[PDB]
Amino acid sequence: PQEVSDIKKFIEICRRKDASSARIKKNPKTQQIKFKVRCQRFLYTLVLKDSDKAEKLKQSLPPNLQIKDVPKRNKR
Amino acid sequence: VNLRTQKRLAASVLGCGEGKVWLDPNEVSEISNANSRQSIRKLVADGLIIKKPVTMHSRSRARELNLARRIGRHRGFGKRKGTADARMPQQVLWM
Amino acid sequence: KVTKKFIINASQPASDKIFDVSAFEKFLNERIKVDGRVGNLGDVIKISQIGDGKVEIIAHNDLSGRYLKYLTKKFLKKMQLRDWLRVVATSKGVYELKFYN
Amino acid sequence: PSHKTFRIKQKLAKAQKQNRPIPQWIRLRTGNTIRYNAKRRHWRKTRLGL
RNA sequence: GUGAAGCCAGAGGAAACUCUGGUGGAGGCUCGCAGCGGUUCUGACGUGCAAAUCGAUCGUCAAAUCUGAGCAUGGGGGCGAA
RNA sequence: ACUCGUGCCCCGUGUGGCGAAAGGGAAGCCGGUUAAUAUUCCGGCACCUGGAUGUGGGUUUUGCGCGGCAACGCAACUGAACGCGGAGACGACGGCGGGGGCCCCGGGCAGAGUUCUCUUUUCUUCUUAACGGUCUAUCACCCUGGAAACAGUUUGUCUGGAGAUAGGGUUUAAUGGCCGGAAGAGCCCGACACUUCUGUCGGGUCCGGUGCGCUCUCGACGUCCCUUGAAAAUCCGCGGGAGGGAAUAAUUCUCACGCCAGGUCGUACUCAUAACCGCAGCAGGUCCCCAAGGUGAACAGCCUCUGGUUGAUAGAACAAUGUAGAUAAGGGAAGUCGGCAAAAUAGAUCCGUAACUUCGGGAAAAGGAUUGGCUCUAAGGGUUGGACAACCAACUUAGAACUGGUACGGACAGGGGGAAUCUGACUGUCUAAUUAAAACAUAGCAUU
RNA sequence: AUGUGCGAAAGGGUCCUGUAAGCAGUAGAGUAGCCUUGUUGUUACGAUCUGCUGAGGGUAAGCCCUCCUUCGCCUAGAUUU
Ligand SMILES: [Mg+2]
Ligand SMILES: [Mg+2]
Ligand SMILES: [Mg+2]
Ligand SMILES: [Mg+2]
Ligand SMILES: [Mg+2]
Ligand SMILES: [Mg+2]
Ligand SMILES: [Mg+2]
Ligand SMILES: [Mg+2]
Ligand SMILES: [Mg+2]
Ligand SMILES: [Mg+2]
Ligand SMILES: [Mg+2]
Ligand SMILES: [Mg+2]
Ligand SMILES: [Mg+2]
Ligand SMILES: [Mg+2]
Ligand SMILES: [Mg+2]
Ligand SMILES: [Mg+2]
Ligand SMILES: [Mg+2]
Ligand SMILES: [Mg+2]
Ligand SMILES: [Mg+2]
Ligand SMILES: [Mg+2]
Ligand SMILES: [Mg+2]
Ligand SMILES: [Mg+2]
Ligand SMILES: [Mg+2]
Ligand SMILES: [Mg+2]
Ligand SMILES: [Mg+2]
Ligand SMILES: [Mg+2]
Ligand SMILES: [Mg+2]
Ligand SMILES: [Mg+2]
Ligand SMILES: [Mg+2]
Ligand SMILES: [Mg+2]
Ligand SMILES: [Mg+2]
Ligand SMILES: [Mg+2]
Ligand SMILES: [Mg+2]
Ligand SMILES: [Mg+2]
Ligand SMILES: [Mg+2]
Ligand SMILES: [Mg+2]
Ligand SMILES: [Mg+2]
Ligand SMILES: [Mg+2]
Ligand SMILES: [Mg+2]
Ligand SMILES: [Mg+2]
Ligand SMILES: [Mg+2]
Ligand SMILES: [Mg+2]
Ligand SMILES: [Mg+2]
Ligand SMILES: [Mg+2]
Ligand SMILES: [Mg+2]
Ligand SMILES: [Mg+2]
Ligand SMILES: [Mg+2]
Ligand SMILES: [Mg+2]
Ligand SMILES: [Mg+2]
Ligand SMILES: [Mg+2]
Ligand SMILES: [Mg+2]
Ligand SMILES: [Mg+2]
Ligand SMILES: [Mg+2]
Ligand SMILES: [Mg+2]
Numbered sequence: 001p002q003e004v005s006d007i008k009k010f011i012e013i014c015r016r017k018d019a020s021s022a023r024i025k026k027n028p029k030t031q032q033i034k035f036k037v038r039c040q041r042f043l044y045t046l047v048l049k050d051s052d053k054a055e056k057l058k059q060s061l062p063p064n065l066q067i068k069d070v071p072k073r074n075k076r
Numbered sequence: 077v078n079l080r081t082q083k084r085l086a087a088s089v090l091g092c093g094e095g096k097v098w099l100d101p102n103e104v105s106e107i108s109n110a111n112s113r114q115s116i117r118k119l120v121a122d123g124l125i126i127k128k129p130v131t132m133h134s135r136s137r138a139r140e141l142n143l144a145r146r147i148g149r150h151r152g153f154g155k156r157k158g159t160a161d162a163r164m165p166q167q168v169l170w171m
Numbered sequence: 172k173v174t175k176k177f178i179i180n181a182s183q184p185a186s187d188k189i190f191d192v193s194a195f196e197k198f199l200n201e202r203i204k205v206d207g208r209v210g211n212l213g214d215v216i217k218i219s220q221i222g223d224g225k226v227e228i229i230a231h232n233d234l235s236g237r238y239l240k241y242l243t244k245k246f247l248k249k250m251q252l253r254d255w256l257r258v259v260a261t262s263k264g265v266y267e268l269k270f271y272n
Numbered sequence: 273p274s275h276k277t278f279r280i281k282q283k284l285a286k287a288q289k290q291n292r293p294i295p296q297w298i299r300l301r302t303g304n305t306i307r308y309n310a311k312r313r314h315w316r317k318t319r320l321g322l
Numbered sequence: 323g324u325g326a327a328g329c330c331a332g333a334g335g336a337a338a339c340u341c342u343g344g345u346g347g348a349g350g351c352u353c354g355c356a357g358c359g360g361u362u363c364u365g366a367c368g369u370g371c372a373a374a375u376c377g378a379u380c381g382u383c384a385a386a387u388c389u390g391a392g393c394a395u396g397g398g399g400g401c402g403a404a
Numbered sequence: 405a406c407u408c409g410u411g412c413c414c415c416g417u418g419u420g421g422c423g424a425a426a427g428g429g430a431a432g433c434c435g436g437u438u439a440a441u442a443u444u445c446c447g448g449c450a451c452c453u454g455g456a457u458g459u460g461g462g463u464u465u466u467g468c469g470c471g472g473c474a475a476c477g478c479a480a481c482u483g484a485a486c487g488c489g490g491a492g493a494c495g496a497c498g499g500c501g502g503g504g505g506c507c508c509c510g511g512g513c514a515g516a517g518u519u520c521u522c523u524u525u526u527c528u529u530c531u532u533a534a535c536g537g538u539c540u541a542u543c544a545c546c547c548u549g550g551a552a553a554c555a556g557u558u559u560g561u562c563u564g565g566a567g568a569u570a571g572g573g574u575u576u577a578a579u580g581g582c583c584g585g586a587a588g589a590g591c592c593c594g595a596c597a598c599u600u601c602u603g604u605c606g607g608g609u610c611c612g613g614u615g616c617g618c619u620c621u622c623g624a625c626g627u628c629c630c631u632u633g634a635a636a637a638u639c640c641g642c643g644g645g646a647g648g649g650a651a652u653a654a655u656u657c658u659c660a661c662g663c664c665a666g667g668u669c670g671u672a673c674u675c676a677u678a679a680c681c682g683c684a685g686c687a688g689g690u691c692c693c694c695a696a697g698g699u700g701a702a703c704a705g706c707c708u709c710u711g712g713u714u715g716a717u718a719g720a721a722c723a724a725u726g727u728a729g730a731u732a733a734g735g736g737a738a739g740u741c742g743g744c745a746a747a748a749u750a751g752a753u754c755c756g757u758a759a760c761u762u763c764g765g766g767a768a769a770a771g772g773a774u775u776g777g778c779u780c781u782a783a784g785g786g787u788u789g790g791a792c793a794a795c796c797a798a799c800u801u802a803g804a805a806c807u808g809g810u811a812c813g814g815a816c817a818g819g820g821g822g823a824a825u826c827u828g829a830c831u832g833u834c835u836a837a838u839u840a841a842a843a844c845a846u847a848g849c850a851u852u
Numbered sequence: 853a854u855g856u857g858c859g860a861a862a863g864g865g866u867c868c869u870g871u872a873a874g875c876a877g878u879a880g881a882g883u884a885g886c887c888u889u890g891u892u893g894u895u896a897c898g899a900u901c902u903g904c905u906g907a908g909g910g911u912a913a914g915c916c917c918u919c920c921u922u923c924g925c926c927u928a929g930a931u932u933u
Contacts (some may be wrong), residue, residue, distance in 0.1 A: 001449065001535075001536070001584050001585040001586090002452085002536065002537075002584065002585095002604095003536090003583065003585095004539065004584095004586045005540095016661080016662090017459095017662080018661085018662065023588090025586090025587090025588070027587085030587080033413085034584090036584095039661085039662095040661085040662070040663095041450090041662085042450090042536090043448090043449070044584090045583095045585080045586095047584085048821095053819075066650085066689055071588080072588075072589055072605095073588075073605090074589090075448075075590050076435095076436065076437090076446090081439080084814085086440080092710095092711095093710075093712075094711090094712085095709050095710095095711075095712070095713090096710095096711095099449090104782045109388090111439075112438085112439075113437085113438070120576095121603090122649090123670085125576095128780090129516065129517085129527085129528080130527075130528070130709075130710075131527095131708090131709065131710090132517070132526070132527060132709090133526095133527075133697070133708060133710095134527065135526090135527095135697070135837055136525090136526065136707085137697080137698080138508095138697080138698060138699095139509080140506090141506095141698090141699095143436085145799085146798085146799080147779095147780090148750050148780090148781095148801095149778075149779095150776095150777090151775085151800085151801090151814095152775060152776075152777095153752065153753055153754090153774065153775040153813090154752085154774085154775035154776060154812055154813065154814095155700095155775080155776085155777085155813085156700095156701095156751085156753075156813085157699095157700055157701065157702095157703080157729045157751055157813065157817085158700080158701030158750060158751085158752075159323080159701070159711085159751095159752070160753075160800095160801085161323090161701090162323095162701035162752095163614080163701070163752095163800075163801095164799080164801075167346090167347090167442050167499080167559070167616085168559090168616045169800085170344085170345070170559065171500085171559045171616090203524085204524055205524095206885090207524080207896090208895095215456090220684080220874085224841080230930080233511080233512085233526080235511085235513090235524065236513080236526095237512085237513075237514085237524085238524040239523070239524095241523095241524070245519065246506085246516095248519050250566085253519095258514095258843080259515095259593090259594075259825070260513090260514070260593085260594090260597080261593090261594055261606090261607080263513095263608095273425090273670095273675095274425095274670070274671060274673090275425055275670060275671090276670055276671090277669080277670080278669055278670085281670075292592085300435095303597090314770085315679080315680095316679080316684095316685085
């Protein structure tokens with residue numbers, strides 16, 4: 001697993017051909033939003049502290065790759 | 077009615093020893109049909125199988141003794157079995 | 172001064188007329204300890220009731236909700252309702268009495 | 273032991289397969305004289321030499 | 323537990339080297355648990371739990387200590403702190 | 405080097421196999437799952453080796469990066485033969501320091517136990533993997549500078565004009581902090597469905613302290629040796645400089661990302677008062693790992709927690725003789741071949757300690773006193789202010805009063821001692837299953 | 853097998869031990885935490901001591917007494933002459 005520092009590198013990674021899926025993990029207790037993208041070798045995580053940038057990044061992400069929202073208590 | 081298998085499965089499911097597994101005396105026939113870990117979990121959720129609490133073991137007397145020795149109550153010559161150097165090494169004191 | 176808020180809710184047994192809220196309140200008066208001494212409420216802890224089968228706890232020290240639960244269990248044992256009533260917590264600072272038998 | 277060679281494992285397999293009672297329909301054949309498995313082996317009675 | 327060299331400080335004296343507090347942590351040293359062994363009861367048992375065990379009491383316990391696996395030496399041969 | 409395998413050109417001192425499931429060694433962690441397997445299955449998240457060729461990046465175009473005084477740094481940043489070096493790769497022991505885990509203490513949260521009386525109480529939970537990023541972490545090394553009125557410094561040592569103290573840096577070393585993994589997991593509570601099919605949904609999952617503590621690991625020191633405590637496979641660095649490298653195009657790249665593959669055999673279970681060997685379900689024997697609380701010097705004995713058992717043919721009675729465990733008035737070895745057996749002594753603290761001696765010992769010689777409980781007092785540290793005050797933290801020692809059964813290492817645990825003789829110097833070894841000795845060995849001495 | 857019966861309790865006696873639990877002090881070496889300038893200032897811990905208390909506990913299992921303490925039991929069942 002690898003942390004991505006900035007939005008530009010995160011979106012550039014999301015544009016990759018091997019990018020399989022992405023998911024948003026919302027931690028309300030910390031007021032944190034994590035964007036996770038699954039590539040071939042590594043899972044890349046970008047951390048944001050506010051919802052405005054999260055929404056703008058979600059709408060600016062490539063539309064081919066699928067996005068999920070990490071439901072609470074994911075089933076086996 | 078043999079419930080050794082049920083006791084073993086319940087111990088595995090609950091993550092305790094077989095000596096902490098409680099099986100309902102009045103539901104022996106129902107428990108004997110479990111035979112599977114899914115059914116053991118179902119019986120645990122229904123309350124027919126219960127993990128008994130651990131046996132009490134307190135340190136209150138030890139803590140009381142420690143505080144009494146802090147104020148110097150149980151440390152006379154009749155309470156010492158090791159030598160002075162065994163109780164408090166001169167090398168550690170010098171260091 | 173910091174203020175901490177606790178609520179003890181005996182609404183169900185109070186309505187069923189088996190729990191004496193005034194007796195419980197006087198029990199806190201005569202049992203809660205401050206600085207290791209009883210009867211030293213000294214306006215740092217105020218334990219008035221709020222009517223709807225609930226007792227309200229203002230503390231200006233590190234008074235603990237478990238001490239409170241311990242005192243509630245002691246009162247239940249004293250008045251012999253342990254076999255039917257139990258003390259539960261579902262959110263921060265609130266302990267209520269529930270029937271279980 | 274848990275550590276086994278293939279040869280040892282194969283011989284244990286053969287011994288396990290030979291450890292059985294005789295078929296019932298054998299005793300119904302004409303001229304049959306076999307009453308029971310005379311070469312039966314048990315892990316607690318007779319030790320097999322590898 | 324004892325406390326070998328080396329080291330610090332202080333006392334004497336003239337010298338040289340005497341002494342006294344400490345520090346240090348040597349030794350096929352020592353008490354003693356496990357392990358290893360097997361002294362005495364000439365105890366138990368003695369058609370036994372056992373073709374050598376059991377109990378108490380004992381020896382040793384930081385190194386000629388205890389021990390696994392692999393390997394070598396084969397019968398007038400081997401191996402032997404004998 | 406050719407359409408095509410077969411044409412040549414260089415180097416050469418070597419030129420086998422087997423042999424370790426505890427030696428060396430490429431790489432996997434967590435959660436879940438079965439009646440029985442799981443570091444192998446499932447989910448998530450990784451890594452290594454080998455092979456291929458891409459995209460980006462870097463370097464260059466008569467050439468193969470840049471920075472720093474330096475120690476060295478940075479994402480790469482050509483490099484044949486031939487050679488040099490490193491790693492693999494190493495003893496035992498001692499005290500000290502760092503880290504992980506465990507133990508302990510305080511507060512808080514949730515649950516449980518007790519509650520005639522008392523107890524802000526007793527107990528349990530409160531977790532964070534591999535793999536990575538980032539910042540640090542002793543020793544060492546570099547730069548400035550030039551030390552006696554020598555200084556720095558460890559528990560111990562030691563270090564310095566071959567350059568110390570000091571000031572500033574570089575660097576090996578995470579089982580350290582934070583972040584990703586990762587809360588979505590696990591766990592704990594709480595509340596609503598139900599013949600089953602389906603469970604569903606809420607919340608919470610924290611902060612500090614302490615240490616001659618236990619265990620593992622790492623580090624710097626040190627001691628001992630007429631003892632100096634493997635090898636090889638494999639991997640890396642360098643010296644050298646052979647070949648090769650399109651001003652509008654690839655680029656002999658240890659950089660980032662990406663593609664493909666990883667065969668075979670083992671994997672259940674026991675490992676022992678019933679799964680092995682002793683004819684057996686035999687009180688014997690059989691190599692390891694982990695290792696809680698109290699007392700206490702202590703993996704001593706004794707009690708307890710987790711976990712595991714309650715399995716060893718039973719019932720009744722209580723004769724002799726037994727086996728095992730004890731007690732006995734007065735005498736105290738008169739017993740007996742013989743004090744055999746048993747008893748007596750025993751911890752700790754403080755006094756005191758002869759003959760002899762190889763000066764090291766003898767020695768715990770011999771002997772004597774004290775020891776409980778309670779209430780106090782003093783001393784032994786760190787931090788901050790402004791010589792005192794405040795805050796923080798364990799234990800170790802000493803002194804006093806009071807008190808009772810004149811008792812207190814209250815069980816357990818735990819030397820009897822002395823005066824001599826023979827003998828072997830000592831430590832050590834042997835007749836497995838009747839002899840452990842004065843026998844053997846030993847260092848020393850001597851001879852060949 | 854109707855008894856001066858048998859048994860189980862209880863009570864009394866005898867005997868052994870040695871003063872129970874609990875409550876209270878002005879008794880307790882002292883200490884602390886708030887105040888009234890103390891003479892008991894009120895409290896809070898405190899081995900122990902004193903009173904209730906020769907108390908409490910045990911007592912036949914091979915101790916004694918109880919025709920009028922209490923609660924039960926009974927003229928069987930089977931075998932042989
Ligand atoms: Mg010690
Ligand atoms: Mg020795
Ligand atoms: Mg032995
Ligand atoms: Mg004998
Ligand atoms: Mg006999
Ligand atoms: Mg023996
Ligand atoms: Mg004996
Ligand atoms: Mg081989
Ligand atoms: Mg190996
Ligand atoms: Mg896998
Ligand atoms: Mg998987
Ligand atoms: Mg590769
Ligand atoms: Mg390029
Ligand atoms: Mg080696
Ligand atoms: Mg401990
Ligand atoms: Mg705690
Ligand atoms: Mg973490
Ligand atoms: Mg310097
Ligand atoms: Mg995280
Ligand atoms: Mg959550
Ligand atoms: Mg170890
Ligand atoms: Mg440690
Ligand atoms: Mg297995
Ligand atoms: Mg056998
Ligand atoms: Mg055995
Ligand atoms: Mg202990
Ligand atoms: Mg202790
Ligand atoms: Mg112990
Ligand atoms: Mg078991
Ligand atoms: Mg038997
Ligand atoms: Mg006897
Ligand atoms: Mg006598
Ligand atoms: Mg006598
Ligand atoms: Mg005498
Ligand atoms: Mg005589
Ligand atoms: Mg005689
Ligand atoms: Mg004797
Ligand atoms: Mg004795
Ligand atoms: Mg001496
Ligand atoms: Mg002597
Ligand atoms: Mg003496
Ligand atoms: Mg005293
Ligand atoms: Mg004594
Ligand atoms: Mg001894
Ligand atoms: Mg000898
Ligand atoms: Mg030998
Ligand atoms: Mg012999
Ligand atoms: Mg012989
Ligand atoms: Mg012998
Ligand atoms: Mg009576
Ligand atoms: Mg009394
Ligand atoms: Mg009295
Ligand atoms: Mg009486
Ligand atoms: Mg007849």
